[PDB]
Amino acid sequence: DFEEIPEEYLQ
Amino acid sequence: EADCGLRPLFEKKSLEDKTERELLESYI
């Protein structure tokens, strides 16, 4: 149930 | 490290959290 985190932290 | 363990919203303001006294009272 986690809100998506900004894509920059997954790049 | 110099400032470690002193919380901005508590110790740095001289405000006490709702249960820290329970810890102090146990340090007999």
Next chain:
Amino acid sequence: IVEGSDAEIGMSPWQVMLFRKSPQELLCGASLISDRWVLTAAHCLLYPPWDKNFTENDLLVRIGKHSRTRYERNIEKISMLEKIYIHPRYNWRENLDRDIALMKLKKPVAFSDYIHPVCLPDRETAASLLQAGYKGRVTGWGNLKETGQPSVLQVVNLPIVERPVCKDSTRIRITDNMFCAGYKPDEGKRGDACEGDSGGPFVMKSPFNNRWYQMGIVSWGEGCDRDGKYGFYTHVFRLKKWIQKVIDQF
């Protein structure tokens, strides 16, 4: 955390969430000990019996959080890992002896009202405070009961337990690198860490200098909040020479 309460804002500004990138999920707690170093339990990263062996690129750390599941825009900070260091004598085969790991961040985190490091104990603070009956504080986003999940960070205060009682509560071999905490069945209060809290901090507030010290790391338990069982914690001071060696070398 079982039988705890909601944390106050900024109550545990050293609390860190270890977050799996894919699938996005909570893995463990952790703590901030400087602008570039995070402390956790080794078993949060390496546990071969469960096929667990996370590498740096699998994980993120989220610092300054209160809500478990929300992205706390303008408050939390998310850091990538430069390097993981597991204690070389971490005993995952038997009893989780020396259950400690460090994570170096790729870039330093900015401190704020919500982000601030905890102290690590010196010998004298450890000797003075690690006594049966003295209470510490455990925090985390783990489950609310053994058999569910919190909206916000939870907090519980628990007494350190006499070593013979710790040993007599379990069949596991207890070492000097562990201590246990929790209420006894006859004490009429309850509380424990639970699944998802491991790796997070057990802290005590020194009455000598009014600073918070991390005395333990949430390590292991048999169930959660069971009568006659206790939570077990890595003894941070006993392993501090290794911490210092890692930080000095790297």
